[PDB]
Amino acid sequence: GHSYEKYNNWETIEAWTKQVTSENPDLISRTAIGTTFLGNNIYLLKVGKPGPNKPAIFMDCGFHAREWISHAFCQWFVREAVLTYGYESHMTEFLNKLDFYVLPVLNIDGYIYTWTKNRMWRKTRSTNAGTTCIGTDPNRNFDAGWCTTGASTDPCDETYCGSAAESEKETKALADFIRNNLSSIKAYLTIHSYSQMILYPYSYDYKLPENNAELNNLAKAAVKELATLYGTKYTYGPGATTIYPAAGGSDDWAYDQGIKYSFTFELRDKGRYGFILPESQIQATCEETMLAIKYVTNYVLGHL
Ligand SMILES: CC(C)[C@H](NS(=O)(=O)C[C@H](Cc1ccccc1)NC(=O)OCc1ccccc1)P(=O)(O)C[C@H](C(=O)O)c1cccc(CN)c1
Ligand SMILES: [Zn+2]
């Protein structure tokens, strides 16, 4: 069975996407935007009060297989949305005025592998010609300074950038969807762990985005807001200087598509447990993260 305070395997998450949609058809619709390399369904949940000509925010989780708290957050977010709609004024206004496209698990094949074989797997599970080595790093697979830095051209490495930009069915599916909905998508949020950061462009180069002052101010406010709940401290900044230059990232790509608010989140913790964050921290992690996501949403809506 599904639990919002435990990590759920894909079979369970999948069943959840069907159930939560069935239980909230006036707030959620489920579509599939493609299949993974191993034929799993890439579900996308459209969360919001249905209406014509609505702007939208896109959020994905589960790019990297071992970052389990990421997957957990997308599920937590959906429940908060549906349970509080009509009662909490902000979320009610959010869902009335816009749609959240929530993609709960992008790299499903990798996620399954972390359950069945290797808890520390990161990449996809696609095969590579000429080698037994498996998988491409999805966050090096986008058309953003593709493979020019912070990436490997070797299929055996954890940062393999792929045979070409969007060589992975999963990243192609995500890019295709966003490209088809550019007119409506006003912000792109991509959830990772760990390190407690909010990153914004650019990561593929040290250059700064045209609106970097605004993004910095937005990130600073979001981290302040996050800290109010449990005191959790995040840092923030351009990806390249805040972690390290890394080309082919989905956040850089989305931004260069014209999506002016594009952020990567790195959730708890700072390395005590790392990727193996205990389920006992799921609730608190998700609750504080909600505050930052809602803050960003409120800002974006107020600046349409
Ligand atoms: C613990 C997290 C910070 C993950 N990092 S990781 O699993 O250790 C692998 C990652 C691989 C890499 C190679 C070359 C250049 C940059 C990054 N290494 C890394 O982040 O090392 C730094 C580090 C290590 C431990 C704790 C904090 C920071 P991530 O979510 O996988 C980081 C993410 C990525 O590597 O795709 C990322 C790095 C730079 C910029 C962005 C924004 N697009 C996103
Ligand atoms: Zn990651």
173 is written with which tokens?
A: 């599916």
Dihedral of alpha carbons 247, 200, 291, 45, sign: negative
66 is in an annotated binding site: yes
Q: What number of residues does the chain have?
A: 304
Active site residue 266: yes
Amino acid letter, residue 259: I
| Residue of the CA atom closest to atom 42 of ligand 1 | 239
34 is written with which tokens?
A: 């493609």
Q: How many CB atoms lie within 10 A of CB 112?
A: 20
Q: Which of 27, 59, 109, 50 minimizes the C-alpha distance to 265?
A: 59
Distance CA 253, CA 172 (A): 12
With tokens 């447990």, the residue in question is 273
Please give the helix or strand (H or E) that residue 193 lies within, else none.
strand 185-193
In the chain, where are the structural domains located?
A: 1-304
- CA 246 to centroid of ligand 1, rounded, Å: 8
- CA 250 to centroid of ligand 1, rounded, Å: 13
| Residue of the CA atom closest to atom 2 of ligand 1 | 194
Q: How far is CA 278 from the centre of its chain?
A: 20
Q: Is 302 exposed, middle or buried (0-12, 13-18, 19+ CB in 10 A)?
A: exposed
234 is written with which tokens?
A: 């995040």
| Residue of the CA atom closest to atom 13 of ligand 1 | 150
Distance CA 234, CA 189 (A): 16
Distance CA 46, CA 136 (A): 27
Q: Which residues line ligand 1 (CB under 6 A)?
A: 64, 139, 150, 159, 192, 194-195, 199, 203, 239, 243-244, 246, 249, 251-252, 264, 266, 271
Give the determination technique: X-ray
With tokens 């055996």, the residue in question is 156
2 is in an annotated binding site: no
32 is written with which tokens?
A: 């599939």
- Do 239 and 200 contact (CB within 8 A), yes or no? yes
Dihedral of alpha carbons 183, 247, 269, 45, sign: positive
Q: How many CB atoms lie within 10 A of CB 153?
A: 11
Q: Is 15 exposed, middle or buried (0-12, 13-18, 19+ CB in 10 A)?
A: middle
76 is written with which tokens?
A: 């937590």
Task: Assign domain 1-304 to its CATH superfamily.
Answer: Zn peptidases (3.40.630.10)
176 is written with which tokens?
A: 């295709």
Q: How far is CA 195 from CA 23, 172, 190, 235, 284, in A?
A: 35, 27, 14, 9, 15
